[PDB]
């Protein structure tokens, strides 16, 4: 399953380097989550392999 990562306040994380963006990848595998691959796609840290128990963007009714 693929999804987008959020931020502390819930906002997303856009980047200026598309493609293998270590920044997004590092923030993807951050800790226990199951992110097999995490790169920036469409100006944003995108990840693939997030369990349903993982919070992704956008957020619930409580958007940023």
CATH class of segment(s) 1-64 = alpha beta
CA distance 52 to 43: 23
| The Cα angle at residue 59 between residues 14 and 24, in degrees rounded to 5 | 30
Tell me the three-class secondary structure of 1-64, residue by residue: CEEECECCCCCECCCCCCECCHHHHHHHCCCCCCCCEEEECCCCEEEECCCCCCCCECCCCCCC
Per-domain boundaries in the chain:
1-64
Provide the token pair at 22.
Answer: 């270590």
Name the structure determination technique. Answer: NMR
């Amino acid at each position: 399953k693929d999804g987008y990562l959020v931020e502390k306040t819930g906002c997303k994380k856009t980047c200026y380097k598309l493609g293998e963006n270590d920044f997004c990848n590092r923030e993807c595998k951050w800790k226990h989550i199951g992110g097999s691959y995490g790169y920036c796609y469409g100006f944003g840290c995108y990840c693939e392999g997030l369990p349903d128990s993982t919070q992704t963007w956008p957020l619930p009714n409580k958007t940023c």
